[PDB]
């Protein structure tokens with residue numbers, strides 16, 4: 405599995421290149437893995453991935469939550485990996501053929517898929533929660549190794565860890581702004597994803613250092 | 624929304640030259656183009672403005688937004704800043720995520736298309752069983768525009784029943800995925816067609832042929 409420094413992944417959802425580069429540079433001593441999603445990519449272009457690699461040499465997870473039919477999923481993955489992303493996130497709810505399409509491209513291109521199981525926001529309870537255990541099991545059957553699950557529901561995150569096993573890699577958003585606790589989340593997740601608590605801070609470096617101090621005994 | 628010939632082109636070519644050329648070849652037949660991530664991630668969000676400059680068509684950004692509400696808001700703002708007239712949004716992530724998109728669309732004078740049931744086989748695993756409830760959620764939220772599957776006309780008909788005749792319904796899966804143009808237009812206001820046109824030896828003839836087959840419905 406990827407070796408994420410300090411078990412902390414920055415969710416870089418600022419939408420201006422200058423601010424995104426500044427904040428990421430400020431926390432680079434603490435974080436070597438950055439999640440870049442559509443807020444930044446649709447604002448600044450896929451070349452933002454290139455710029456991050458050039459400036460910081462951080463791993464990049466393209467958080468695109470791929471959720472189309474298999475043929476379109478393949479195209480999205482190909483374009484994303486062409487641009488230099490190490491990994492891409494994929495929704496499981498559109499079913500196994502859609503996930504397999506992404507896995508096939510990732511295999512061909514030597515990159516990784518992260519399967520999004522249950523989401524962290526309140527609306528996730530309407531439809532996603534009820535499907536999440538089966539989505540996780542589907543991922544295991546398909547050979548998925550990397551997963552995303554919610555910091556905001558420790559009981560659900562624990563169950564998802566059970567389903568995927570200790571050998572699978574699990575990252576977890578919802579820490580800080582959405583209410584999840586870093587230490588508690590790391591009981592189950594390999595790494596926590598943190599966005600606003602860092603990037604909206606007066607001193608993002610101090611914010612990251614503070615989170616790390618709070619989980620020091622967990623590495 | 625008034626769609627010319629009830630036909631929306633799904634422009635999923637990934638090369639700017641080809642996408643512009645093929646869209647140009649069929650321009651006399653359409654006034655609405657769906658642009659998705661294959662083209663946008665290959666050529667940039669600036670491609671939306673360039674389609675407007677070249678063709679004047681309306682643009683649906685088929686981004687199937689499927690994040691938390693805070694992130695959905697940002698995705699919608701970026702998309703509408705690029706000149707999209709409408710955006711597609713997954714209903715599966717729940718009502719707060721949909722409302723986030725509806726709020727931005729209202730602020731910027733655009734439309735949200737709610738994706739209810741998808742057209743591919745995998746849709747049967749989780750989406751299909753939630754689809755009627757997703758559509759009712761759309762109705763509760765005041766959603767006026769919906770997407771449902773050409774590949775399952777009985778499901779498309781049910782979706783139409785739920786949302787009523789006043790709502791606007793567009794439907795992909797025509798042609799390549801096996802859906803029939805005429806049957807789909809029994810229920811949908813417009814059909815989405817990608818590969819059957821853009822991979823055709825002669826895309827203009829392909830579009831002309833589809834329109835000929837539904838001429839009595841226009």
Ligand SMILES: O=c1cc(O)n([C@@H]2O[C@H](COP(=O)(O)O)[C@@H](O)[C@H]2O)c(=O)[nH]1
Pocket residue numbers: 415417441467520522523524525552553554577578579580581582597598599600601690691694
């Ligand atoms: O279930 C999920 C899955 C996500 O990818 N995310 C993403 O993780 C990040 C959370 O950032 P924040 O720490 O500001 O709440 C955002 O980029 C969001 O899109 C999430 O919040 N919940």
Ligand SMILES: O=c1cc(O)n([C@@H]2O[C@H](COP(=O)(O)O)[C@@H](O)[C@H]2O)c(=O)[nH]1
Pocket residue numbers: 472473476633635659685738740741742743770771772795796797798799800815816817818819
């Ligand atoms: O359920 C759905 C929803 C979609 O947006 N689509 C989209 O509609 C288009 C169908 O293209 P095609 O006619 O080549 O099969 C693609 O852009 C696809 O992403 C779909 O096929 N099924």
